[PDB]
Scaffold this active site. Structure first.
Site, PDB file in Angstrom:
ATOM      1  N   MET A   1       1.472   3.431   2.124  1.00 23.88           N
ATOM      2  CA  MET A   1       0.362   2.558   2.482  1.00 23.88           C
ATOM      3  C   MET A   1      -0.763   2.769   1.466  1.00 23.88           C
ATOM      4  O   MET A   1      -1.645   3.617   1.653  1.00 23.88           O
ATOM      5  CB  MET A   1      -0.125   2.849   3.902  1.00 23.88           C
TER       6      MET A   1
ATOM      7  N   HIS B   1      -0.707   7.791   6.250  1.00 18.67           N
ATOM      8  CA  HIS B   1       0.452   6.979   5.922  1.00 18.67           C
ATOM      9  C   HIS B   1       0.782   6.918   4.440  1.00 18.67           C
ATOM     10  O   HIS B   1       1.484   6.010   3.991  1.00 18.67           O
ATOM     11  CB  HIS B   1       0.268   5.579   6.499  1.00 18.67           C
TER      12      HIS B   1
ATOM     13  N   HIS C   1      -5.622   4.375  10.848  1.00 18.66           N
ATOM     14  CA  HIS C   1      -5.706   4.179   9.401  1.00 18.66           C
ATOM     15  C   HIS C   1      -7.088   4.561   8.897  1.00 18.66           C
ATOM     16  O   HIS C   1      -8.047   4.610   9.665  1.00 18.66           O
ATOM     17  CB  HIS C   1      -5.475   2.710   9.028  1.00 18.66           C
TER      18      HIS C   1
ATOM     19  N   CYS D   1      -4.098   5.190   2.549  1.00 20.61           N
ATOM     20  CA  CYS D   1      -4.311   5.578   3.927  1.00 20.61           C
ATOM     21  C   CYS D   1      -3.709   6.987   4.045  1.00 20.61           C
ATOM     22  O   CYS D   1      -2.484   7.144   3.996  1.00 20.61           O
ATOM     23  CB  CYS D   1      -3.571   4.615   4.845  1.00 20.61           C
TER      24      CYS D   1
END
Ligand SMILES: [Cu+2]
Ligand SMILES: [Cu+2]
Lengths: 98, 98
Positions: B91, B86, B39, B83
């Site tokens: 995210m 993601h 991340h 992120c």
């Protein structure tokens, strides 16, 4: 305890003040842009894992007074670093984590 | 108060938990890598100065659980971020500084 390091001394020198700080594993160090900008923090990889040194570095340059960068040191060791644009002037530092 | 945000929920979802945090100007937010690595934190520049958003971002990817990144927010505003790897999974997060 958590430490604060000035980038560029009050006396107007291209130095990290204080140049050497000692903290406990898990604590953090905050670098605050003070005088004679710009500055950045780059850890060299001798004595510590190359990737840890990279994760602790903040390559972007800080210009305004009061700007800061923070790094948390969870692993014990001696971490030496420097300010890229001011390496020649000897703007280097050290963080001892115990 | 200072906030801590988990990257990847305990329930095993690609989310920032808590997704929205509210702090006071001058305080910091620490993102800690939890589950479903890797991340990173990238702030978008809408509603806030482009360069401030860049200074707050941490583009490097975190892999090990327990690794963290810290950003100090001295200027009031609503900072949305995400992120990168993601983004499709949704995210995303938000920091409200008052
Ligand atoms: Cu410098
Ligand atoms: Cu992610």
């Amino acid at each position: 305890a958590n430490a604060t390091v000035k980038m560029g001394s009050d006396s107007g020198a291209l130095v990290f003040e204080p140049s050497t700080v000692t903290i406990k594993a898990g604590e953090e160090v905050k670098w605050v842009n003070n005088k004679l900008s710009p500055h950045n923090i780059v850890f060299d990889a001798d004595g510590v894992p190359a990737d840890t040194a990279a994760k602790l570095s903040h390559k972007g340059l800080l210009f305004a007074a009061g700007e800061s960068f923070t790094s948390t040191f969870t692993e014990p060791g001696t971490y030496t670093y420097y300010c890229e644009p001011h390496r020649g002037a000897g703007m280097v530092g050290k963080v001892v984590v115990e």
